[PDB]
Amino acid sequence: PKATYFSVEAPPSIRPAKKYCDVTGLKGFYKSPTNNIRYHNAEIYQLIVKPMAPGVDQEYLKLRGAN
Amino acid sequence: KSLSLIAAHSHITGLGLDENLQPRPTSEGMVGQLQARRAAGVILKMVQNGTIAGRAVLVAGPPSTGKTALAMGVSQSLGKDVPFTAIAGSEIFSLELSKTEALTQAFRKSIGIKIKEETELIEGEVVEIQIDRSITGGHKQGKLTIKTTDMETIYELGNKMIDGLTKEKVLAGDVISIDKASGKITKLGRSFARSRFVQCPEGELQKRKTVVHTVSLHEIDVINSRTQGFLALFTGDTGEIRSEVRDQINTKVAEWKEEGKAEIVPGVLFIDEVHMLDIECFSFINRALEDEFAPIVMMATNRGVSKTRGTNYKSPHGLPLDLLDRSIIITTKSYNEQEIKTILSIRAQEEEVELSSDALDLLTKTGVETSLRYSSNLISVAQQIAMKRKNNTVEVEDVKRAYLLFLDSARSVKYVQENESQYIDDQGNVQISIAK
Numbered sequence: 001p002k003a004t005y006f007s008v009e010a011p012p013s014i015r016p017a018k019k020y021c022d023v024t025g026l027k028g029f030y031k032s033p034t035n036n037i038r039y040h041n042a043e044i045y046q047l048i049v050k051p052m053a054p055g056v057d058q059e060y061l062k063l064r065g066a067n
Numbered sequence: 068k069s070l071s072l073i074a075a076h077s078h079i080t081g082l083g084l085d086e087n088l089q090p091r092p093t094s095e096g097m098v099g100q101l102q103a104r105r106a107a108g109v110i111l112k113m114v115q116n117g118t119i120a121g122r123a124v125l126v127a128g129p130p131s132t133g134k135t136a137l138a139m140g141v142s143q144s145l146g147k148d149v150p151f152t153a154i155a156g157s158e159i160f161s162l163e164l165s166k167t168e169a170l171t172q173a174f175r176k177s178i179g180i181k182i183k184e185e186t187e188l189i190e191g192e193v194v195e196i197q198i199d200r201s202i203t204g205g206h207k208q209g210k211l212t213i214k215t216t217d218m219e220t221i222y223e224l225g226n227k228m229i230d231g232l233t234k235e236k237v238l239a240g241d242v243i244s245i246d247k248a249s250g251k252i253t254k255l256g257r258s259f260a261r262s263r264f265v266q267c268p269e270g271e272l273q274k275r276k277t278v279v280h281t282v283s284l285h286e287i288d289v290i291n292s293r294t295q296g297f298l299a300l301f302t303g304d305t306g307e308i309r310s311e312v313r314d315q316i317n318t319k320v321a322e323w324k325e326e327g328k329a330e331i332v333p334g335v336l337f338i339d340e341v342h343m344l345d346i347e348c349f350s351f352i353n354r355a356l357e358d359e360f361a362p363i364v365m366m367a368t369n370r371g372v373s374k375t376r377g378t379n380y381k382s383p384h385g386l387p388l389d390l391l392d393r394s395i396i397i398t399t400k401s402y403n404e405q406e407i408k409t410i411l412s413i414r415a416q417e418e419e420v421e422l423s424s425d426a427l428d429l430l431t432k433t434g435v436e437t438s439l440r441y442s443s444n445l446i447s448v449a450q451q452i453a454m455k456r457k458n459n460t461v462e463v464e465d466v467k468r469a470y471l472l473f474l475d476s477a478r479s480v481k482y483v484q485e486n487e488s489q490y491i492d493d494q495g496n497v498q499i500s501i502a503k
């Protein structure tokens with residue numbers, strides 16, 4: 001077995017990747033349980049993550065491809 | 068404060084001094100001895116400056132003139148985070164340690180190192196803890212929902228957190244503080260979910276903090292002396308710590324001060340009734356203040372020209388001459404009528420309910436006549452016999468009853484003198500029988 005277009009596909013990394021905030025992009029210390037959104041701190045949480053208008057969480061996760 | 072009942076020096080909340088060190092006539096529970104109180108304020112400002120090492124002060128005077136009150140006032144006005152060790156003259160005669168060793172330990176307990184450390188702490192309320200405990204092997208997994216007033220988040224937990232949460236069994240709604248570095252959770256309590264209680268934690272989970280640590284040099288000496296652990300600090304079997312580990316700790320402390328990750332806080336060592344120390348102890352104190360890491364020693368004595376223990380000659384204040392040379396002396400005087408009235412007023416105000424004014428005058432007259440301490444001890448028993456009469460105030464006749472019952476020193480001495488054969492003398496002669 002050998003292929004060209006599929007054997008040059010890069011395999012997933014063995015080192016665990018760095019976690020980042022979804023809306024700001026710093027360290028996501030916390031992830032909201034209901035929203036599944038990585039967020040940096042409290043004012044980010046209560047200012048963006050709580051009053052977010054529904055359907056925006058999927059396009060949030062679409063950047064990381066978790067939608 | 069821990070558990071504190073009413074004691075002798077309980078009214079003293081510090082030196083009653085202004086900003087220019089001039090003593091107020093009555094402030095912070097202390098009245099009188101204004102020259103001595105100004106001197107104690109100057110010594111307090113010395114210790115608070117912290118640039119002067121190894122001075123000795125000698126608080127000498129008549130008994131019951133407030134020397135221990137002055138030292139307790141200095142200790143109260145110093146506040147916390149500055150070490151204070153109050154020992155007596157009979158403590159250092161140890162059955163296991165030598166005299167100079169006990170003096171060295173007491174010297175090094177009053178020198179402190181201040182270290183600022185920044186740690187990590189996560190503290191919140193557990194909304195819900197789940198564990199997917201499908202243990203096909205040793206691996207297990209679970210998730211934790213932790214909430215504060217401004218946080219609500221879910222965590223993915225590794226195996227060691229599952230082990231740490233199996234013990235110290237956290238239910239939903241409990242308040243926990245997690246140290247991520249050491250993996251030690253503390254169950255502060257349960258939040259307001261009754262339907263011991265603690266308030267729900269405020270926002271900003273994962274908040275670093277600075278906990279300022281002050282340890283004495285004696286604890287570092289006990290730790291660095293390798294065969295004694297920190298259990299020697301509680302058990303007391305430190306057992307003749309060697310000089311080389313002390314020298315190593317002094318060099319390390321100088322290195323820490325120079326490189327700036329530790330600050331040294333000088334303290335005060337108080338020796339009550341210093342006249343009971345031997346001449347060997349006076350020699351070690353005589354040569355112990357020349358070390359740079361030596362505290363400000365306070366000594367209090369109430370003896371005249373007396374013998375020095377371990378010798379046979381007499382010396383002033385019960386101390387040898389070179390130790391008197393290496394110390395400045397604070398003098399204290401006795402109290403007149405108004406000072407006795409003010410002291411009894413303050414002690415009766417704190418200790419119990421109010422007195423009638425003629426009873427307070429009778430207390431002041433008795434305190435002038437016999438002793439201040441005898442009147443202060445008469446206050447409480449007069450109040451108790453007033454409660455036995457079922458009256459709120461303390462009258463003159465309750466004081467008369469307590470004066471009839473509880474004798475002072477002079478009446479006891481006199482009554483011993485008229486009844487001599489009933490008692491046992493130096494030669495062990497006593498007439499127990501009453502007939503002929």
Ligand SMILES: Nc1ncnc2c1ncn2[C@@H]1O[C@H](COP(=O)(O)OP(=O)(O)O)[C@@H](O)[C@H]1O
Nearest residue numbers: 075076096097098099130131132133134135136
């Ligand atoms: N200036 C003062 N202000 C308030 N209380 C005092 C004062 N002087 C002495 N006392 C009180 O007198 C009692 C005995 O005094 P003490 O401290 O034993 O004197 P000394 O230290 O000279 O032996 C203590 O309860 C103390 O509170």
